[PDB]
Design a protein around this ligand. Sequence first.
Ligand code: HEM
Ligand code: HEM
Lengths: 454, 454
Amino acid sequence: IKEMPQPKTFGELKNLPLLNTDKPVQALMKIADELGEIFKFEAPGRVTRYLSSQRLIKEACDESRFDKNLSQALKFVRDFAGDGLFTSWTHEKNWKKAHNILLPSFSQQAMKGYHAMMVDIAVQLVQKWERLNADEHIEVPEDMTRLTLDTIGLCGFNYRFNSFYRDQPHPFITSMVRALDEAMNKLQRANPDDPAYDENKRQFQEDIKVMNDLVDKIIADRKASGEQSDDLLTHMLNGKDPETGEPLDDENIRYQIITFLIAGHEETSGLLSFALYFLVKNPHVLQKAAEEAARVLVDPVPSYKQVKQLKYVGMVLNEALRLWPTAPAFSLYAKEDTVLGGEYPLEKGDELMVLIPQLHRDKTIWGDDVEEFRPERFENPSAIPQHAFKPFGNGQRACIGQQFALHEATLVLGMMLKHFDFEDHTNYELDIKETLTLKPEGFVVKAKSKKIPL
Amino acid sequence: IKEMPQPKTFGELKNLPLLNTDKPVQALMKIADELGEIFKFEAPGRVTRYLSSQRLIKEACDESRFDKNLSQALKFVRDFAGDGLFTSWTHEKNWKKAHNILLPSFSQQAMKGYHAMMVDIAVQLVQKWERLNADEHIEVPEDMTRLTLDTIGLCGFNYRFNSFYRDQPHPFITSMVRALDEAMNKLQRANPDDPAYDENKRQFQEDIKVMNDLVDKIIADRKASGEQSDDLLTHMLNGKDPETGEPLDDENIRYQIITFLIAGHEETSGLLSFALYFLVKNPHVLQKAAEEAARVLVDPVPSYKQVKQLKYVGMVLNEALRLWPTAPAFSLYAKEDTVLGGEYPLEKGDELMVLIPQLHRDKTIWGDDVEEFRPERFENPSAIPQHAFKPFGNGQRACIGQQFALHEATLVLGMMLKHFDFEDHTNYELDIKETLTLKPEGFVVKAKSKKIPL
Ligand code: HEM
Ligand code: HEM
């Protein structure tokens, strides 16, 4: 039985001011590097324990002992994502109901049905880059975010955000980004009741209304027309939970749609942006990936089956997720009093946070070369020990969108590698911006077209 | 679309008399040198196409298109190795079950637990060499086989073959060697049902009985005693497949044990033998390796972490596997009608053989200096083209023992290089003996002790 370390405190604010940064996950990573596999983090009225080792995280991932917790961040996101899958407690009726309805809509098999819509947006991206002038560059996370948001709009509810037709965001996205920003900013405030925050609060309510109005309108429009499409919305309007026999109500559908849009905008674009960063920094890898894309993607546009053959491209994506998991943390609570790791007593209800970037850097698992970008670590997926690699979370509360995200990312990276050579013309210095997700802020490249027609 | 070449035929026996040699792999390598990257090889009732270029092998390694085939050789080995992992089809229930149960036992993590038992045998080898008198030499494949067999016996099922205490093999080994010899010789026989071979069949049955008797007794004895070891047998007796929830039955366990014993006796001893051959033939490389061993192995016996630090020794082992892969071929079948390399049409079920020593000599990958021994080729795995280097096979049917073999070989080669200087006193001319594996027959060296304690 041992006492847990704790980072530096600030009197009555305890550890809370350590989150007063633009880069809180990176701060927590540095604390983990200093304090080790577990540390206590206290704010007024709450305690969290941050886990960094596979030894401890493997136990936390035992679903008979620990369940998903809504972290303070998720509780704030729940003000606009409601009881959608991501911001639901496992024990809420609407979690299991929506899970049972949507799970078939997100299978590997269901991706055959989304593939054409994914290709539509991917073609838009390739065409944009083909149309750049010689003196121009690509704003990577900006174009990746255009792609990933539009893809989930089209596949999700047959709505075109038309992000490649715009400098600034669609108004809906302006409101979503600002709502996510407020949710994340609230985490740092010592007195959130201060009237200095009244304008933030009003703007938050306005942004929620904008989001709800577009989504609610689309749902109502779809029901009135009776049209049947290949999108998640059709599946949600027709679906019945085999357990309750109930369909999702229109309010719940709206929350799911908002949830999917957030995942597309945030984590998926991050993955792509980091994958391109690691490629341009590791030209042997980029050559190997480009060779695969060239030999596999023999047709003007990729088929579903061809995307499945892009093994090395998938390895690149996994190794990007290892170093910079774009959903960097998830929270758990103890279902009963218990002891973690033979050493750390927990009371029922105690909160754990899994710090995924640190798990992915556990030298006990990965070796001493943890900071190196080496996709060949993933050559033989059989080799990865259990609960060592968790970029999509854990168990029944793992990411429902994992197949969608990897299919999209594999397809897009494949097409990018087929159609262009890339140059890190600025020798970009990695600068990671934190929202809900992580992204390489300011990352720019030049593309030289290989002149291969679509 | 092209006709593929074929070597010389013998009327109705087709190509089969080309295998009527005690060095068939070397014969097939010369055929590849003459005919190029693919050739058809026909025997009465079977056709297989031998591939030698990375260009075609990178396609053959696509698991969506090709699966592991039991070559005629593996079909004969299956008479004593059963539906163990090596001689199973991917679609047999027992393949996936055993695979799921045994993967954690063969992980890089599990090697921490075998390390002490590997050290035990490695110290026996070092001590034997320390005890030679001035005018004596080392019989290299003989001693390496003593070591590798004993290591898997001890780590596999807490059984000591005590090979360092014997000139003549343990009776179990006599039988296993003679069963492997029968299996391989049967390949060359045009009329296997000639009574000329009835003595061979009776001996084959007696040898299988000898092998089964020891292994079934060991399993029974372990179950009776109830004892709990750090060995594969313990994990196989207590393990349950996560998928089916079932344990392995005793028959299957016995096949797994027999399989592991074969791999230790054969391929692993070949690797160490060729590694020492290359080192004594390349004294600058030997020196660089010896310097690394001296810098890293600072304790009387190596720790697990010190072995992981022997990076150049690992590269030496990879460069030995490049030139003389001790499992020199594996077989695949086409899961569907398909076209290989845009040129060679295949029907569902058609067989391919990957001729690994020829793949590893592809000058388009390795460059002009392909016959040179240069460990530095392996400094960066990302610089190696996809599917260029396949000594442990491919995909989900790759060698489960790879981490074991490389840990053992790195350990032993490290300790050899720390404790002794080596002399190629006879200017040995490489003569490769073929069984299931390749070994340098008659390879002898003299060792001069550095007089460093254990
Ligand atoms: C690379 C991209 C993605 C990453 C890294 C990622 C990561 C995660 C993680 C870690 C969780 C677990 C959260 C927790 O335990 O609190 C999760 C849940 C979820 N993700 Fe993703 N995600 C990605 C893309 C997506 C996409 C594209 C969608 C939908 C279109 C999606 C929908 C969801 C949903 C609905 C859940 C909640 C599932 C449940 O608990 O029932 N995600 N995601
Ligand atoms: C103690 C050492 C070893 C053990 C216990 C071992 C075990 C095995 C097993 C059980 C398989 C079948 C895996 C499956 O299909 O699920 C296998 C395949 C293989 N092993 Fe090993 N092995 C060892 C050492 C080696 C070495 C040193 C080499 C080569 C230098 C090697 C080369 C291979 C190859 C090429 C295959 C694939 C066979 C094919 O596709 O038909 N093995 N090994």
